[PDB]
Amino acid sequence: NKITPNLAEFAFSLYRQLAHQSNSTNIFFSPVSIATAFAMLSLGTKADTHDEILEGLNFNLTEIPEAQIHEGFQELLRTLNQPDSQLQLTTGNGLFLSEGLKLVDKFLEDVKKLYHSEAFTVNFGDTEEAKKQINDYVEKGTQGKIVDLVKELDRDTVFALVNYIFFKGKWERPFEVKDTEEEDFHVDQVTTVKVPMMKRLGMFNIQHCKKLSSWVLLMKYLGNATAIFFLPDEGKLQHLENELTHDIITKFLENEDRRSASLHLPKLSITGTYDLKSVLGQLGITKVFSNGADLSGVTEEAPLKLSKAVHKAVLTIDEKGTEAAGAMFLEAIPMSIPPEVKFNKPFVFLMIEQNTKSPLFMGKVVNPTQ
């Protein structure tokens, strides 16, 4: 995909933002779902308001034609929306607009048609009821996994955006549940907590990488996606985070070589919840959230700004991701000592969609039971 490098840069800019704020919180978000929602929104915007959004998603508008940006997203979307999908991704974006705004039909068509997204009209005159309808939409869309997403609305809200994603992947080569046991997780150099720890002896795409001073593990999911886990050497987490680049990730993805390892990887259930006005504001996207907003592609008559924009991402990592029996296979394990590679201290990860190479998720686990 032509927009993948931009999405990768966007992932890292957003990640580094969130990490710079604190190294004591788990991080999990979807560069793809956030960028898709904001590229979609830009269709309703003009001039500086429009350009700030696309530049804040790491597109250099002097270099990449807008049609290519949207064709990029639309290609990515139809990949993630395949009827077959074993990925089982649950994602949506909801726009909630004041009833009695005269809405531009082209915008509503672009949202639904091009971006296969949803737009609703609500009575923002009733703040509590609007919040309920927004939260109900998300709860319904996730058949119950995300509850009470929006906690507050400004009394002057006339436009809110909610973007949700939940993923529980199925490993192509799964862990056996019988092997999951409680183990130490080193939350710092002197402190441990107990966490459920999966383990398997297998042939892995795994390597210890000098440039990143980290172990780098790639594991495939059923459907079209790969999880990449980066385990920094003692004291090297900040180094790892600084050194990550699109080129480097591309190299790992091209490596198919496999070697024996006794892998220990925690079960995880992690969420990330982000105020996108706040977070994207630090990346330069500010006008669309301000009284200045040029949202004339959405409504021509009345003033409009985006008052509320929230992202919530939910990840489960477990042994199989399904109760179904998987395809039986056999990996040939050499008679030699496998390295023991334990994801039992803070680590960073990315999930990549295989067709486009896009960064579906990025995160950091500082403590599995936080």
Residue numbers in the entry: 24 to 393
The authors write:
α1-Antitrypsin is the most abundant antiprotease in the human circulation. It is also the archetypal member of the serpin (serine protease inhibitor) superfamily of proteins. Serpins are characterized by a metastable native fold consisting of nine α-helices (A–I) and three β-­pleated sheets (A–C). A propensity to undergo stabilizing conformational change involving expansion of β-sheet A is utilized in the structural transitions required for protease inhibition.
We have now solved the highest resolution (1.8 Å) crystal structure of α1-antitrypsin. A new 1.8 Å resolution structure of α1-antitrypsin demonstrates structural variability within this site, with associated fluctuations in its upper and lower entrance grooves and ligand-binding characteristics around the innermost stable enclosed hydrophobic recess. The increased detail provides insight into the mechanism of β-sheet A expansion by delineating the hydration of a relatively hydrophobic environment around the highly conserved Trp194 residue, rendering the initial loop insertion site conformationally labile. Occupancy of alternative rotameric orientations for Val216 and Ile340 became apparent during refinement. These are found on β-­strand s4C and in the hinge region between β-strand s5A and the reactive loop. Previous structures of native wild-­type α1-antitrypsin have indicated the presence of zero, one or two waters in this region. Fascinatingly, the intrinsic fluorescence spectrum of α1-antitrypsin reports the formation of both the intermediate and polymer during polymerization by a small blue shift and increased intensity attributable to Trp194. Moreover, comparison with 2.0 Å resolution structures characterizes variation in the conformational dynamics of the allosteric pocket in solution.
